[PDB]
UniProtKB/Swiss-Prot annotation:
Protein localization: Endoplasmic reticulum membrane; Microsome membrane
Binding positions for heme per the UniProt entry: 37, 61
Record's keyword terms, sorted: Acetylation, Electron transport, Endoplasmic reticulum, Heme, Iron, Membrane, Metal-binding, Microsome, Transmembrane, Transmembrane helix, Transport
GO molecular function: heme binding; metal ion binding
GO cellular component, one term: endoplasmic reticulum membrane
Modified residues annotated as N6-acetyllysine in this record: 3, 12
Membrane protein topology class: Single-pass membrane protein
Assigned protein family: Belongs to the cytochrome b5 family.
Name of the featured protein: Cytochrome b5
Length: 82
């Protein structure tokens, strides 16, 4: 099965308690990854609650980074909001 979230509910996860963001229509919960991110947490918090696909691809993450990102996927963006 697959869980779908709307932009409306995703935007609510941008506080000290929860940090979600969208990348290529997938929703990631990076709450616990903020302090481990080699790129720092400020760059993630700034994109929280929205689509950060361009900024993500702009930096050109390595293969290993993309493999690791999969562990943080909690669902996908609802088809109606794409
Ligand atoms: C999906 C979660 C993400 C994972 C697993 C992740 C992982 C990493 C890793 C492992 C690196 C080290 C370099 C590399 O291997 O490419 C890195 C660097 C970096 N990340 Fe991320 N990242 C994520 C999302 C993002 C997002 C959304 C942004 C910005 C909007 C971002 C901005 C950066 C920057 C600026 C660097 C440093 C690049 C440099 O020093 O040249 N990352 N990230």
């Amino acid at each position: 099965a697959v869980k779908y979230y709307t932009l409306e509910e995703i935007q609510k996860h941008n506080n000290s308690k929860s940090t979600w963001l969208i990348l290529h229509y997938k929703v990631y919960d990076l709450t616990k990854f903020l302090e481990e991110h080699p790129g720092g947490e400020e760059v993630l918090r700034e994109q929280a609650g929205g689509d950060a696909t361009e900024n993500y691809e702009d930096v050109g993450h390595s293969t290993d980074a993309r493999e690791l990102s999969k562990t943080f996927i909690i669902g996908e963006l609802h088809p109606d909001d794409r």
